[PDB]
mmCIF file of C-alpha atoms (C1' of nucleotides) in Angstrom:
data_model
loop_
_atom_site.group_PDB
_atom_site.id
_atom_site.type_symbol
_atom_site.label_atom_id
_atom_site.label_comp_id
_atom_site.label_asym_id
_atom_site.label_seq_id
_atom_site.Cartn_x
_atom_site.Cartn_y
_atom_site.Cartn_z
ATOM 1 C CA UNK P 1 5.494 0.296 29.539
ATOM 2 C CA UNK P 2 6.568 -0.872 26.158
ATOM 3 C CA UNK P 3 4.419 -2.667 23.976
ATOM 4 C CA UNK P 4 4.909 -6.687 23.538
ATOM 5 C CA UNK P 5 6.671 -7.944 20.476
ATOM 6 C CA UNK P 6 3.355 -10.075 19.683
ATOM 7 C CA UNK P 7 1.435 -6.870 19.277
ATOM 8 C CA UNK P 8 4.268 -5.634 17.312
ATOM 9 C CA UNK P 9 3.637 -8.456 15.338
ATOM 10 C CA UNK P 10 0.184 -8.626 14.754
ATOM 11 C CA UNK P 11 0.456 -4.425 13.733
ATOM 12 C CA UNK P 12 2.973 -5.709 11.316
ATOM 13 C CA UNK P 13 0.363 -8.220 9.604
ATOM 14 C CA UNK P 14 -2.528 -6.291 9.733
ATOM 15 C CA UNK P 15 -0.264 -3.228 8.018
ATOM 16 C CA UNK P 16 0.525 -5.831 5.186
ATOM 17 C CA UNK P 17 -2.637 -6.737 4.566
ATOM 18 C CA UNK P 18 -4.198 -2.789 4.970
ATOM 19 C CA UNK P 19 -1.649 -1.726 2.702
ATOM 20 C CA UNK P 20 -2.328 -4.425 0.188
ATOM 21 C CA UNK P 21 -5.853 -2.715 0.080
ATOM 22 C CA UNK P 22 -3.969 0.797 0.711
ATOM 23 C CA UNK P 23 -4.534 1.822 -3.288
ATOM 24 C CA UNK P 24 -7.524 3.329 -5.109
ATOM 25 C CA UNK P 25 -6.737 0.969 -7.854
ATOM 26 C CA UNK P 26 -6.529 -2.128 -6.078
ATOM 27 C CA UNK P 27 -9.714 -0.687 -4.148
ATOM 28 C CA UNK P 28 -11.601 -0.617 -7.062
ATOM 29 C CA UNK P 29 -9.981 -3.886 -8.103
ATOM 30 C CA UNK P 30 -11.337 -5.589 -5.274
ATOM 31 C CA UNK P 31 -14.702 -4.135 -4.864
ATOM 32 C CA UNK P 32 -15.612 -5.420 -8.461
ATOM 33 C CA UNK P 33 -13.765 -8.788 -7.577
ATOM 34 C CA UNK P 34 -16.090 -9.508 -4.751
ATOM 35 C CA UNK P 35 -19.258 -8.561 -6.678
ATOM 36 C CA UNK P 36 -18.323 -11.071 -9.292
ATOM 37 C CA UNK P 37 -15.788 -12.719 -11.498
ATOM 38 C CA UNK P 38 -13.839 -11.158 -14.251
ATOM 39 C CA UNK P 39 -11.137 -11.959 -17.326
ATOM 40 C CA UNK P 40 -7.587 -9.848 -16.732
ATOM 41 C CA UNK P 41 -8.931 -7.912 -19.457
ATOM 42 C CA UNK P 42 -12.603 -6.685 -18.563
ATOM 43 C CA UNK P 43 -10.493 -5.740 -15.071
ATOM 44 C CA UNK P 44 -8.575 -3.812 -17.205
ATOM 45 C CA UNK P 45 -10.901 -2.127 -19.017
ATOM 46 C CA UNK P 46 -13.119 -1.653 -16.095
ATOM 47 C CA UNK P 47 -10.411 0.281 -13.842
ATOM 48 C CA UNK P 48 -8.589 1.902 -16.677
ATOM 49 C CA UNK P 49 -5.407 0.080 -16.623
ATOM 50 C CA UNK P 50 -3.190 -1.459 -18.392
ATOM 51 C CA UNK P 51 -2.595 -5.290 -18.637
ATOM 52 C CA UNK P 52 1.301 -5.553 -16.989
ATOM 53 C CA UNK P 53 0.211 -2.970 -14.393
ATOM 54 C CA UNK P 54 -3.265 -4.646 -13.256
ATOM 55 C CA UNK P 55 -1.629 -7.984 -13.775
ATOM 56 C CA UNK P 56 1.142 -6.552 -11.422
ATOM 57 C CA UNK P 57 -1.703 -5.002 -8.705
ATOM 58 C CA UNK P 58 -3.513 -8.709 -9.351
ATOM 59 C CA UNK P 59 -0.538 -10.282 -8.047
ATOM 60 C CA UNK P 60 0.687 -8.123 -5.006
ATOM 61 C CA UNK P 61 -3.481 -9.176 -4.182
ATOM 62 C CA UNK P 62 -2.188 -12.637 -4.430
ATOM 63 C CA UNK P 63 0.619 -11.911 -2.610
ATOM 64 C CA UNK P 64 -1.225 -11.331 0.184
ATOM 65 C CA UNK P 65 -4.459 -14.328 -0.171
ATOM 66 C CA UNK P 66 -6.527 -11.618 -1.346
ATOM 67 C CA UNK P 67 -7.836 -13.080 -4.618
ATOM 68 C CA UNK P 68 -9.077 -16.640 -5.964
ATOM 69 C CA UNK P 69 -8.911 -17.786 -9.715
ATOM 70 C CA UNK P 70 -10.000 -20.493 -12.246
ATOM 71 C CA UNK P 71 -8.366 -21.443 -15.352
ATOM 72 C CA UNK P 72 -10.702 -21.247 -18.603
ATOM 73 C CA UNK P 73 -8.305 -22.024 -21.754
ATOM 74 C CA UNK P 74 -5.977 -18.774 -22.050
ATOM 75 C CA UNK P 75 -8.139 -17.052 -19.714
ATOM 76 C CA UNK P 76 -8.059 -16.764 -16.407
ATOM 77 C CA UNK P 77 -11.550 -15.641 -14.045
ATOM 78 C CA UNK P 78 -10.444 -13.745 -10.515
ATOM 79 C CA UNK P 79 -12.961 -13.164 -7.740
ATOM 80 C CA UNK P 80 -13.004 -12.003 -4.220
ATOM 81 C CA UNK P 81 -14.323 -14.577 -1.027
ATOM 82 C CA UNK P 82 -11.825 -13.110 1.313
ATOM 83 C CA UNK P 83 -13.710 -12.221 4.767
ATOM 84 C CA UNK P 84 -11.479 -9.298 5.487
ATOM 85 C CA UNK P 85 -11.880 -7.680 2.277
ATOM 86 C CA UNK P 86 -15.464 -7.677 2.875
ATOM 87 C CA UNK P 87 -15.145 -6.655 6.536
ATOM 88 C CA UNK P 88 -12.664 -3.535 5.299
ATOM 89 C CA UNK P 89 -14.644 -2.749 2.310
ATOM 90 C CA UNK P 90 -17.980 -2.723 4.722
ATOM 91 C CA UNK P 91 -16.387 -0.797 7.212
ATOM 92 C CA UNK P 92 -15.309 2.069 3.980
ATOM 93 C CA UNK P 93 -18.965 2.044 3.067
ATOM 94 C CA UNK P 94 -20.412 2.675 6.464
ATOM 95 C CA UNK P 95 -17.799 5.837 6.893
ATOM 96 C CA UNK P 96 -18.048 7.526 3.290
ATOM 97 C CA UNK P 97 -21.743 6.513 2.945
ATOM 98 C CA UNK M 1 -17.253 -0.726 -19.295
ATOM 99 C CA UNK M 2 -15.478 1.408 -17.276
ATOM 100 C CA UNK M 3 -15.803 3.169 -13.549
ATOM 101 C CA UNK M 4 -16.709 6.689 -13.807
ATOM 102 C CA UNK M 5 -14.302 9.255 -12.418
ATOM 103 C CA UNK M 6 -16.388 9.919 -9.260
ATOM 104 C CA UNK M 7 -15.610 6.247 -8.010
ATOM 105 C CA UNK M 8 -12.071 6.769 -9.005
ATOM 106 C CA UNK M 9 -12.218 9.226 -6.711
ATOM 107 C CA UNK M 10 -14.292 7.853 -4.016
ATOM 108 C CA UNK M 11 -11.356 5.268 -4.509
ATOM 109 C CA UNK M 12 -8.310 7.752 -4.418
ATOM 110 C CA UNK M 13 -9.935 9.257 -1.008
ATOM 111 C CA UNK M 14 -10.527 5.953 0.541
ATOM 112 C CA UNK M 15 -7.353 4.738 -0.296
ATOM 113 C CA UNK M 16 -5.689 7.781 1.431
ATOM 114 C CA UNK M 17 -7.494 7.246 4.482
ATOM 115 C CA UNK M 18 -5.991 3.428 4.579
ATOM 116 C CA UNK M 19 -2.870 4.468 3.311
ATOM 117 C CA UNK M 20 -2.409 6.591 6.511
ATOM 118 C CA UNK M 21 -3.648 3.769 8.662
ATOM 119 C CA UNK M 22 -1.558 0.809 6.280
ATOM 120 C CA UNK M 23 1.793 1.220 8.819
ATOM 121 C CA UNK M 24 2.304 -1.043 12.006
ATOM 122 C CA UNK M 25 4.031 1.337 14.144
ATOM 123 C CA UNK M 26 1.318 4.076 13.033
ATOM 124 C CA UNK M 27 -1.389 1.113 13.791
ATOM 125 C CA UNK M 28 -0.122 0.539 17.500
ATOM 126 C CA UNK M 29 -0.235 4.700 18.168
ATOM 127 C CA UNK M 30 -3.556 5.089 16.279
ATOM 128 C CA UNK M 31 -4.844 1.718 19.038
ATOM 129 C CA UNK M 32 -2.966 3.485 21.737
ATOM 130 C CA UNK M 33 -4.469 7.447 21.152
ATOM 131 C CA UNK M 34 -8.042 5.836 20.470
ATOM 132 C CA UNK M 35 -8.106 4.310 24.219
ATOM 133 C CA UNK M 36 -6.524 7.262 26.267
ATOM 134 C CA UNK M 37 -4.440 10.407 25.681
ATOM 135 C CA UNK M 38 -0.691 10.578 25.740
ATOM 136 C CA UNK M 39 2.095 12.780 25.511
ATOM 137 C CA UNK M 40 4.571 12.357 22.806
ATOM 138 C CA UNK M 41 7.777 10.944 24.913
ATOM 139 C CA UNK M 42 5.168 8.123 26.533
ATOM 140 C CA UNK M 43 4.204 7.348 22.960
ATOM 141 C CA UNK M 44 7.661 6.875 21.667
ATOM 142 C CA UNK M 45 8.517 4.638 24.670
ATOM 143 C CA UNK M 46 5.832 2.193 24.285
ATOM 144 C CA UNK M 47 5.587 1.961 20.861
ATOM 145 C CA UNK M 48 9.459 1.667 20.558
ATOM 146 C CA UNK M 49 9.495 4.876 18.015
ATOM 147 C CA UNK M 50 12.510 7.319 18.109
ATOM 148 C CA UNK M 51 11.363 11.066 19.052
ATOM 149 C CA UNK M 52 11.683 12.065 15.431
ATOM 150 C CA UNK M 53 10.594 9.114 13.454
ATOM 151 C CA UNK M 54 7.017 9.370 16.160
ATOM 152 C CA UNK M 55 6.824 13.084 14.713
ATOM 153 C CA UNK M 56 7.000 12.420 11.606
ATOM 154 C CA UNK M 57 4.213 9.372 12.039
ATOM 155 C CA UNK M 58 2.231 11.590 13.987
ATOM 156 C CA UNK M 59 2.680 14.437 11.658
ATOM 157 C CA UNK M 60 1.014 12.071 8.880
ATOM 158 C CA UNK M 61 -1.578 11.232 10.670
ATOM 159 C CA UNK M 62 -2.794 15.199 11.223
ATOM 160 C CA UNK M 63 -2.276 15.144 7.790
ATOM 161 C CA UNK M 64 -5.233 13.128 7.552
ATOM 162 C CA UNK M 65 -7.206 14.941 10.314
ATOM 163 C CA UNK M 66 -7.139 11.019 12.566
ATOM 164 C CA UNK M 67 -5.845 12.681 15.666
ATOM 165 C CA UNK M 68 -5.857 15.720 18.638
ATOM 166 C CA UNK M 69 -3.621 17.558 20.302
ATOM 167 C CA UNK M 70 -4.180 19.582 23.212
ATOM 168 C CA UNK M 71 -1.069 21.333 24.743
ATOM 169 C CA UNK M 72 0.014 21.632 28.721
ATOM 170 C CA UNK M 73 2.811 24.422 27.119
ATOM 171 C CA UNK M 74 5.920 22.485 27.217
ATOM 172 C CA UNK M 75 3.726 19.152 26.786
ATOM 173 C CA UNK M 76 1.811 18.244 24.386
ATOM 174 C CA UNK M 77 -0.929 15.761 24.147
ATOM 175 C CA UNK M 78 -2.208 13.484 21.261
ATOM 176 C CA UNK M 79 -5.469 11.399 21.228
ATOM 177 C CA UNK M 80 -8.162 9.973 18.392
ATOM 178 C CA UNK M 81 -11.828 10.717 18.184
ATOM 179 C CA UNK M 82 -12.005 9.325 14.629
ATOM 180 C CA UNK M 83 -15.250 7.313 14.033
ATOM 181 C CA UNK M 84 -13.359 5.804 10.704
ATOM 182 C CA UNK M 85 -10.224 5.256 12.747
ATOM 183 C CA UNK M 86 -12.158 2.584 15.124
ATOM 184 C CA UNK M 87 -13.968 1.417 12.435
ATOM 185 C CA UNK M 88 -11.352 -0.135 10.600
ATOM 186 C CA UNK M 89 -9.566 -0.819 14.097
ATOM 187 C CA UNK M 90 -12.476 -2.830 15.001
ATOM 188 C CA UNK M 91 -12.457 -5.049 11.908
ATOM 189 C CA UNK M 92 -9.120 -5.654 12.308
ATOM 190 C CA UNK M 93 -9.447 -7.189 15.559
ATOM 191 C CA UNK M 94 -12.653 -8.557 14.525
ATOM 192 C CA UNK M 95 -10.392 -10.262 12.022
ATOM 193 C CA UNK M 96 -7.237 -11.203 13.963
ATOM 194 C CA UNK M 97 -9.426 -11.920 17.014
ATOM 195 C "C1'" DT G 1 8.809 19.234 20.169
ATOM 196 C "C1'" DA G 2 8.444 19.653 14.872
ATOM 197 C "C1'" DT G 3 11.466 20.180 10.490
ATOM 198 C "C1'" DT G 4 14.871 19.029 7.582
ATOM 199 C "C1'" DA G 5 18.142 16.105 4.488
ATOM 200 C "C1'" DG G 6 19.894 11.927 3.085
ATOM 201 C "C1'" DA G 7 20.357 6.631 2.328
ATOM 202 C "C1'" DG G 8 18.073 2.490 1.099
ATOM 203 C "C1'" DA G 9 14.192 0.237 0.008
ATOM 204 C "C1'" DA G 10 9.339 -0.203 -1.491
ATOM 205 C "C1'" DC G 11 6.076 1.489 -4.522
ATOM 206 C "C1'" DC G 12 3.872 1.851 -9.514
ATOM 207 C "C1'" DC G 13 3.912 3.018 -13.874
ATOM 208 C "C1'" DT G 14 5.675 1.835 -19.193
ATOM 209 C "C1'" DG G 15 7.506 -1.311 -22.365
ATOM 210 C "C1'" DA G 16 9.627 -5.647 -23.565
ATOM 211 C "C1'" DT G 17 10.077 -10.541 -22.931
ATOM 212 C "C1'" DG G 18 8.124 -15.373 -20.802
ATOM 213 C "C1'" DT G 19 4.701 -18.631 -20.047
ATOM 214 C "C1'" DT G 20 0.687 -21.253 -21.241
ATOM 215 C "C1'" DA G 21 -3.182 -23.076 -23.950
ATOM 216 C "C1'" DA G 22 -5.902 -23.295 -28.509
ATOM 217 C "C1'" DT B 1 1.592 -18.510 -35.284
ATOM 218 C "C1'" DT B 2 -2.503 -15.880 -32.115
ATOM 219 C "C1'" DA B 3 -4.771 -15.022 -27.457
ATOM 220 C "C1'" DA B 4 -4.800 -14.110 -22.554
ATOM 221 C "C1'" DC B 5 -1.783 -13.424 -18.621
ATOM 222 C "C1'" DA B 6 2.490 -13.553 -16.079
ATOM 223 C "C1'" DT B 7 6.778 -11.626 -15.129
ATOM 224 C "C1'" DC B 8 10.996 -8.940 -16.085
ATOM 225 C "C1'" DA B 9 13.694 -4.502 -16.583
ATOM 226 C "C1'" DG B 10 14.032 0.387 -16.170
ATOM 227 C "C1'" DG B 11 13.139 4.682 -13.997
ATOM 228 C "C1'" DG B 12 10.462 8.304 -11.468
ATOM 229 C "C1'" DT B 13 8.031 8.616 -7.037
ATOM 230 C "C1'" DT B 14 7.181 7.651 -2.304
ATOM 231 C "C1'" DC B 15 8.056 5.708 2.194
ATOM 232 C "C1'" DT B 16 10.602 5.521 7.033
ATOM 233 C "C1'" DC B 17 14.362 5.375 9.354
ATOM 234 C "C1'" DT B 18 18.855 8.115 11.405
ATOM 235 C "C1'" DA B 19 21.569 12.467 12.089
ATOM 236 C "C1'" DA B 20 21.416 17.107 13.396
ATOM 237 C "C1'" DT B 21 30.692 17.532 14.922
#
DNA sequence: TATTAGAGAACCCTGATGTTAA
DNA sequence: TTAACATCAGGGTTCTCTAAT
């Protein structure tokens, strides 16, 4: 029997959301967001990236709810609350150790 | 300041495994092969796959050591055995419900 | 059955231009 | 103007399907 079009659906979701976390940069990106906030630029500096391309990776996390932020002047502070990043990201530290 | 190169790589590792799991179709086998064995044709018919494009799906995911095979000669058999694989599976569906 | 090649799109960088607030 | 980010434009790389008269 052929699978139902809802399951199709929900594989289709959860693939969008895995593969927004599907990069070691983003990875990184997130772990550090959910441990606490950070300016574009310390991000930057802290995964060894420039600003376009971590301001690109910031907003494909966006893209998919991944990230919150809060306006200070010109600068802009990104965290983590999202319950499935932690859930993913706990599930990665209880394989690799 | 920044990540040293061991997390980058702890990253670049962890990011392959989710890379090989961040596909629908390839999510619906991996469910599929973690909760019985099946033979390639089945697989193709309930996951709605062409013979070729399954092979190639399935082909990735040996190339990430996430799956079996046994063989019956003309038949052959895939399943999952992964610890990681149901892992992530399970927060998934601890997330989606 | 697994392997190939090719089209079309998504990815991910660099570098330049936009947007927004002091 | 400067400062901190966002987005655009391009080009090389990677994905995932079909065709295999």
């Amino acid at each position: 029997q052929p699978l139902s079009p809802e399951k199709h659906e929900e594989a289709e979701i959860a693939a969008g959301f895995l593969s927004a976390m599907a990069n070691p940069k983003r990875l990184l990106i997130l772990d550090s967001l959910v441990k606490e906030e950070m300016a574009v630029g310390a991000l930057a500096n802290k995964v060894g990236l420039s600003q376009s391309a971590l301001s690109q990776h910031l907003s494909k996390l966006r893209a998919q709810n991944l990230v919150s932020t809060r306006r200070d002047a010109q600068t802009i502070y990104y965290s983590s609350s999202s319950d499935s990043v932690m859930k993913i990201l706990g599930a990665l530290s209880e394989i690799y150790g």
